[PDB]
Design a protein around this ligand. Sequence first.
Ligand SMILES: Nc1ncnc2c1ncn2[C@@H]1O[C@H](COP(=O)(O)OP(=O)(O)OP(=O)(O)O)[C@@H](O)[C@H]1O
Ligand SMILES: Nc1ncnc2c1ncn2[C@@H]1O[C@H](COP(=O)(O)OP(=O)(O)O)[C@@H](O)[C@H]1O
Ligand SMILES: Nc1ncnc2c1ncn2[C@@H]1O[C@H](COP(=O)(O)OP(=O)(O)O)[C@@H](O)[C@H]1O
Ligand SMILES: Nc1ncnc2c1ncn2[C@@H]1O[C@H](COP(=O)(O)OP(=O)(O)O)[C@@H](O)[C@H]1O
Ligand SMILES: Nc1ncnc2c1ncn2[C@@H]1O[C@H](COP(=O)(O)OP(=O)(O)O)[C@@H](O)[C@H]1O
Ligand SMILES: [Mg+2]
Lengths: 327, 468, 340, 324, 315
Amino acid sequence: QQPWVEKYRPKNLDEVTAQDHAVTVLKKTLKSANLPHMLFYGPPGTGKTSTILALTKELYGPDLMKSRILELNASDISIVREKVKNFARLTVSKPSKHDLENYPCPPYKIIILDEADSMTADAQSALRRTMETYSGVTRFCLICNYVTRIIDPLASRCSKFRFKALDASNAIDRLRFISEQENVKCDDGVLERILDISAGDLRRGITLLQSASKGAQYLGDGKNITSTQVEELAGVVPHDILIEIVEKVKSGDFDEIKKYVNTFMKSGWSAASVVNQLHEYYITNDNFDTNFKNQISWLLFTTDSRLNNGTNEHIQLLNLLVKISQL
Amino acid sequence: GEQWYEKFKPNCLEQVAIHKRKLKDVQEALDAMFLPNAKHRILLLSGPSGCSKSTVIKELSKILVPKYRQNSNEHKVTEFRGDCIESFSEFLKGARYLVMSNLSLILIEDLPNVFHIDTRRRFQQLILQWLYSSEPLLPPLVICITECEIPGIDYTFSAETIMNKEILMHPRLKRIKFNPINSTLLKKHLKFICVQNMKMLKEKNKWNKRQEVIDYIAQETGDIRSAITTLQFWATSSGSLPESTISYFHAIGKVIHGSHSTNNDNEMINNLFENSNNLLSKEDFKLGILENYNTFNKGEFSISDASSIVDCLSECDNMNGLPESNEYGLREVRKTFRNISKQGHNHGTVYFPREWKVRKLQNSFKVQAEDWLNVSLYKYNAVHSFRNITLEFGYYAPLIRKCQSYKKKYILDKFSDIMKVENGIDVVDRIGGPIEALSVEDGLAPLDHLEDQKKERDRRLRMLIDQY
Amino acid sequence: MSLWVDKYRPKSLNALSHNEELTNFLKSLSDQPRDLPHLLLYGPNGTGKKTRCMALLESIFGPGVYRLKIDVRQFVTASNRKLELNVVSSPYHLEITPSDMGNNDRIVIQELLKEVAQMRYKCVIINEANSLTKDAQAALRRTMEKYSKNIRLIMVCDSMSPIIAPIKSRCLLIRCPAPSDSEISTILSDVVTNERIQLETKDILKRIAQASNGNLRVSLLMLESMALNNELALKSSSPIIKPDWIIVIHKLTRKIVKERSVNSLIECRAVLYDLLAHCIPANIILKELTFSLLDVETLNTTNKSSIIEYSSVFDERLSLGNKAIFHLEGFIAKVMCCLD
Amino acid sequence: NLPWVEKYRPETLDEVYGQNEVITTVRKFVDEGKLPHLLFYGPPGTGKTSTIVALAREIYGKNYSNMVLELNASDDRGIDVVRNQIKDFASTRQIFSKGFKLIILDEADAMTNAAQNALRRVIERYTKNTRFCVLANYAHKLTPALLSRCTRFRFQPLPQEAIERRIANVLVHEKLKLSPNAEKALIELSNGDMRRVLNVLQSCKATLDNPDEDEISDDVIYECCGAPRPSDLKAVLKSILEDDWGTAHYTLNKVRSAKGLALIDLIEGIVKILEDYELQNEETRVHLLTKLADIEYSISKGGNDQIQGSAVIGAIKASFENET
Amino acid sequence: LQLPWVEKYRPQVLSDIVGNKETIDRLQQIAKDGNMPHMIISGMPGIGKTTSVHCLAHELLGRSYADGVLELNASDDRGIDVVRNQIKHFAQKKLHLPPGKHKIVILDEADSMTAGAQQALRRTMELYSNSTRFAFACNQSNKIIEPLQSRCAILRYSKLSDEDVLKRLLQIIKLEDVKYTNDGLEAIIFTAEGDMRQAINNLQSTVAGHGLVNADNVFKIVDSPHPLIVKKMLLASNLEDSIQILRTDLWKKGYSSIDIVTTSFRVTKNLAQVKESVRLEMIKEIGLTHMRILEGVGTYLQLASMLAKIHKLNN
Ligand SMILES: Nc1ncnc2c1ncn2[C@@H]1O[C@H](COP(=O)(O)OP(=O)(O)OP(=O)(O)O)[C@@H](O)[C@H]1O
Ligand SMILES: Nc1ncnc2c1ncn2[C@@H]1O[C@H](COP(=O)(O)OP(=O)(O)O)[C@@H](O)[C@H]1O
Ligand SMILES: Nc1ncnc2c1ncn2[C@@H]1O[C@H](COP(=O)(O)OP(=O)(O)O)[C@@H](O)[C@H]1O
Ligand SMILES: Nc1ncnc2c1ncn2[C@@H]1O[C@H](COP(=O)(O)OP(=O)(O)O)[C@@H](O)[C@H]1O
Ligand SMILES: Nc1ncnc2c1ncn2[C@@H]1O[C@H](COP(=O)(O)OP(=O)(O)O)[C@@H](O)[C@H]1O
Ligand SMILES: [Mg+2]
């Protein structure tokens, strides 16, 4: 059919919730009839892409927009530079009578570079040069998460828009509305569990909800979503297994920890998820003193760094558990 | 000042440096070409330098052109130059008239500026038009191409890149590939040039030691012109003219055993690095150290020093070939071995790394695994991954097949499936051989059975296809 | 005839016997072929992920995917070099293992996927997806974004961590836990009944399953080897045939524990070259050596902790290294020093 | 209108300040009028382009348009296009035929070696007709041949007083108000580069609602430059040093999420702030530097962000434990 | 306006040439033999390759040097056809010479050009082979196609080393009447890195811009990181002083991290008081920092960590 992320995207600017300041500034700029280079930044899944798409749809119109809007991920510099140059150099098509009747179609095109913060300094300098070359007819909208990763020369050329993190109420209401519209039956705590797993990212939450709905449809039972299915889809280890791991670590016996790790590795659960869950459990616990947390932070950091390099999960997990047991 | 090869260029067809097979094939093809209703208009020779491509053509033409010339000399080969200062088209049009009584072989060794795409397109179009010409009477066209590359047209200038597919697979174009001159013919020609220069050789007293150098020349390259030039240079030069293993031995000994002329480690390290950078740049040096450090004091030192040396070598390997990595590794090795040196040096035999043998064994194992996979697919409809073959099916399946074959032989429906094993097309020996140990490569062995193994695998694949 | 490992391999979703929930999920998924998503099965090696993929493909496209053919499709690398990678193909699907290439796996994936798309849909099975390079994963992301309609991906992996986040988001994650000892014993008993192998006691199957360590493939291989070696009559005292390289690693562990000397180090290094010459991955050798050392009953807690530290450090070194011999020798030397 | 970089570009050599040595060295060329090949190198935003343009204007006069061709080595078009343009400009007969022709090439250091040999060849071909002033940042990355074919001129960093007076000049010609803290922050961020100073000032003026009656603040400058605010970094450091784990973790996450501050930037800012701290034990600095460098290296390759932040907090706390 | 110093007084005979003594002896024996085959010269430029060829021409021809030598860049006009035309015009010119001696043509920079035109040059040499002998200059011997190296003889050169660089600098200063000091010559040699052309250019620039040739004066013109500053930073007893030096004299001056680490490694390679263990530990730390920088993290914190590790090592 279609992913629910794009299907339920906000249509107009007024449909964006909990973004009063940025939305108001964007409406003021739209009324001014002068669109400068835009740099949207904020935590993921807050509507930056939705806000920019709504702004374009209110500028060119539903039909004309497809001709004046380009989207690129800015990942992996020659290729993206060539595509941007080709899109910008192309002559703007002629607006139709209906487009001009109700939309004040500006005489320029918009290119949206998502994940702009992932670019390197040289790539950002090349992008700045391209912007300067084609500033007259092209307006850029760089979507990112951290504004500090953009080089100062490039950042100074764009008006900045900060997006605040969505509150739990707005996200839960949005998920509930989507579920009712799509006829999704979920047990109490399922939506909150999805939000917790997604860490407030509505994109990931909606994707997980769609996956859980598909799984329930496949199941053929009452189709009442349960937190266990959500965790299984998200790859989150069950909390009970984490509790047993913590108890074994507290025991301190090397042989028992080794046997438990050997048994666990047969389950197929990822070691990275276990490391993240252990970090969350230990860092946010009031039963451990300052020195214990000082040591556990470094131990977890070292284990995560070793895992990220493509190392054997079994050995790294066993070493981490042995180290924690010895603290 | 005059050059030897120009002085002693071949005069007949018997002194041409080329194998008899290629000479006969070229002669037969050229003779059949001269026939009125010929099948090929362009003869394309393509091969490496110094293969007597144009020389053989000229020698054959000297005798062949008069045979087919019609009633109405020295115009046997109207060669075209690529630096004449559209010329190729004019040359082709002019040669078109060179028929009947104006017969003259055409030779295109020198090629025009074909670097730009437009020039290559023009050349290809002209060749296609010549091949498509309906003129029953046309002059011979011969194109000689020398293959060279520097690892597109820029990368290589072989035949494949010079003309398009339509000309490469043209039904009416004969392509011949030459081979470098063999050692025997080159030696014979060099000794003939000697026999000619006996006078000056005796005057210089180099006749007694010529055989000591000629072989080397014959073993250097198969280029007749280059070999003759080298022989002339050696005969003219009054000095002595012409390693890596000796340098490797000295470097390894200095790194491990240490130098005696200089007592300063830093000075020795800096001088060795400055004098020999290419030798230490290669990764193998590190491996050599790992293979030679144990030789110090015939292995009579504490395990702590060996552990430190190996840890440093691993750290240097992780540095990914940086200039500081080799410096650090060598300085650790020298410092560690200097702290436990008793009085002097025990220069034990230097062993080269075993990595190359391991790589060859791995290649053989991969070939055997591919053969086993093909056999399994074509005899049991089973597909297995390479990792599974290396870990699981490398040992279990050969043992099972060997046991089944032994039972089948002993017997000749409890064992009905057992006797179904076909000895010819079933692997019964563990892939890669027994896992016992690998010995040190004391011998030089700077470096094939892989080609034979691949041929055997192809034969088995064909047999399975016939069965399937 | 065909090996018992392949002879009794399930050929349908109804022939499965372990992980009934996963079987029901696969049956439900096959009931609607049109909306089949991109699947990522992750789990331990030898559990039966490939068998489940084959069963699902048979249920969707019918009993025709089991007829496989091998084709050698050659391509050109970036440096104008001729590369060859074999492809296993069926009339309705194809199987590829880009890990066999290495760093230059993106080109092969791109070319194969584009060619398949150009020609309802076809199923591409990416074997060993966890070992794919990051750029290869990005190319896969591009193909999923573009050619989702015509190409459906079913990727089987030993570990799920290496997979990049976007691929996880765009794909349906399915965990494949290893079979329990009881289920392995039941399968081996069924094979015994179908093969007429006399058993003095039923504990032989349990011991074989325990030795296999959850690997059904290896368990079946041991069962067949022991049955053939014991005149098709197993006994409680019949030895368990383990992989030869495993026994070599055990001998190496015993030698390291007993003799801690430079000459012993050289002999162990030679054994390491011999093991590597048989294409055994360095990481697997390190893991097996470390776990064999940890199983020694004469070592105290401090020695075990030091051994596991050194194993982790040298595994990280292997991941970022080029030559495996250096790191393996360093780990062995460190273990010898700590023990001595 | 025109960007402030070129709007306030010096018109004469007498308007170039902070480079008195090179200015007096080149004041002879305008008098004599014979211009050889030149190579201006130095840190960016020091007046190399301004100096060469002023000298060309003073020498040629009204013929600047037809006797001065300005090109950038990092143009969007291929470097072959730049070579073709140079060839066309040099070969074409001089319309006025008075003196040599000047080609001001900028960002020459960014070229590859082969491009530099090509530029040297082009310089050799048209020595009698074309004069080249190669503008770069550092001379050491240029090939020795090109360096030999050109006369070197080094531009020293602009004095801080010169930047102060130029900023005052811009703020008086342009009806703009800048607070002392904002100007100090702008100078610190620029690091002596006048291009960035002018660009940031123009952007800040643009962002102002009413530029006639509004004053720029340090917060505005930081927002325009997109750099970490010192106040946020100091607050995070204080929370890490004088609060429990829960409070420090919450503060770090809140600041990073609500200010768009990357972990690497936060680490660099904290290191810069701590370099001014007066520590008792010298091992604390070593531990801080090593652990933070390791964390930054790990972050560069990706991983878990929460674990990295907790590692930063724990490293700082453990290192500062040595103080007592 | 004024011509470069290096070109003003280029060596005229092989005796003045220094470095690669075996190759010089081979050139001398070839010259006295009177028969000169084809050459393929390889090596990093600036070590008297072309100058050695012209000196060999001097020793061989003598009075007919200007009438029997042609130096061609092979890419000045961006065309091989014009190069072939020039070669034809030169070789085809009829000039009577004594028996044995042959005209010399130098084709500089043959490594930045494609294989097909290498074959074209081989054909040109083959056609004009009894009158002209070619000396192909290149930076890599393997890059040249196999037929070319088979036809010609390879001459491998290397760097001139600090001793000979200093020697030539002493003669240049003696003839130039330049006031110099030992530290200035040491700085010039350090910046040259074995390149004679770079050393002469640096000396000329220092003499022009400034007066007495001192290390400070030399590096006022070179612009590279000052070795004495890097040495003081590395050997500073207190960590805070080293950090301050790195921040002020190096980081705020715009010097890149890669240049700083390269200079630190070069300085560490040559030290006196540092023990061998300390020297090699410092080399290891510098190498790790270089590896980290090359992978993308070219930040100041890496340099600070390197300095901290070095200071810890000195304790
Ligand atoms: N015995 C010989 N056999 C062949 N060529 C010889 C012999 N003696 C001297 N030569 C000379 O060596 C050269 C080799 O012949 P030819 O040039 O035709 O071959 P080639 O490999 O096609 O050449 P190229 O590389 O120039 O295209 C010619 O100059 C030939 O005159
Ligand atoms: N402010 C908002 N109001 C309504 N929906 C939102 C908002 N922010 C995010 N969403 C929802 O999240 C989904 C994905 O948003 P996403 O594109 O990830 O935003 P961003 O690119 O800013 O992270 C959308 O389908 C949208 O419905
Ligand atoms: N449910 C099952 N019942 C019986 N045998 C099975 C089952 N699952 C797997 N096997 C056996 O395991 C062997 C290998 O399984 P495989 O598909 O390689 O697992 P993986 O994909 O995890 O490597 C097969 O030969 C098959 O006979
Ligand atoms: N020496 C100087 N004197 C006065 N202003 C300068 C000087 N150098 C730079 N500037 C100012 O910096 C701005 C840009 O200078 P720029 O052309 O980038 O110099 P460079 O090319 O040396 O970087 C100009 O508008 C100018 O006002
Ligand atoms: N040993 C030397 N003695 C004196 N001058 C040298 C020496 N080596 C190089 N040079 C100088 O370098 C310049 C060119 O030398 P060379 O390296 O042969 O050519 P290229 O620099 O084009 O490779 C000459 O002008 C010469 O003065
Ligand atoms: Mg020939």
